[PDB]
């Protein structure tokens, strides 16, 4: 045990959630990320199959970790007197979708579609595992620039998935649905689809559609860049004001604009200059 097996590199980011450092498992040189979370800043606790009292993030991480590389896997975790320390995988080289959009602006449709699909495949995986992320957005998506594979990260506002209503949200406002904004209630799926509508608008317009509460409640989408009619259709569908007017994952993934997606490898070859 102990803090022997890992070697702490540079800090990767921080905030009110905590601090993440680059790290190398000594045990065999694998890249990892070392995420330190303060007990005081966890509002949502959970408990394991094993039955111990851990942050919800750790519960959800365990339920989603396994073969499929569309979600970042949690390799191990530790407890400390005032924090939990999480060890997760780290692709090399890697960059987050937010930075990648800051650099390259609006993405070519073909690139967006391959990115969007992959997010769709990640979120479907979480939904199967009984996990709801609740904070899907460019900053919670890592690109592995060599293999062209997106990895969803940061379950710190997630919850167990359920069919009843959610009356709490501790995620990103500008990505939250209008039913949350007015009534303080949403349902998982439909609120996830809204965040995906936002995410796709982001990808294709270089930036997010709404900044203020009223623009959210109004739900009218102005396009600032050339975007095909079919992409515009899908975005507006995901951003239906009534939750039940929103598409299901299956309906999103059968949308005409979602056809003939590139593979992750082809994607890096053509767009990440692999
Ligand atoms: C997404 N934020 C709030 C923090 C956060 N970062 C990571 C995780 S796993 C993880 C794994 C790798 C890397 C490497 C990133 C490069 C772009 C700087 C970061 C993270 C998380 O769970 N939370």
UniProtKB/Swiss-Prot annotation:
Pfam families: Pkinase. Signal peptide: none annotated. Autophosphorylated on both serine/threonine and tyrosine residues. Phosphorylated. Interaction with PPP2CA promotes dephosphorylation. Ubiquitinated, leading to proteasomal degradation. It comes from the Eukaryota. GO terms for cellular component: cytoplasm; cytosol; nucleolus; nucleoplasm; nucleus; plasma membrane. One of its GO terms (biological process) is positive regulation of protein serine/threonine kinase activity. Residues 6-258 form the Protein kinase domain. The active site is at 135 (proton acceptor). Interacts with RP9. Interacts with HSP90AA1, this interaction stabilizes PIM1 protein levels. Interacts (ubiquitinated form) with HSP70 and promotes its proteasomal degradation. (Microbial infection) Interacts with Epstein-Barr virus EBNA6; this interaction upregulates and stabilizes PIM1 and induces cell proliferation by inhibiting the growth suppressive properties of p21. This is Serine/threonine-protein kinase pim-1. It comes from Homo sapiens (Human).
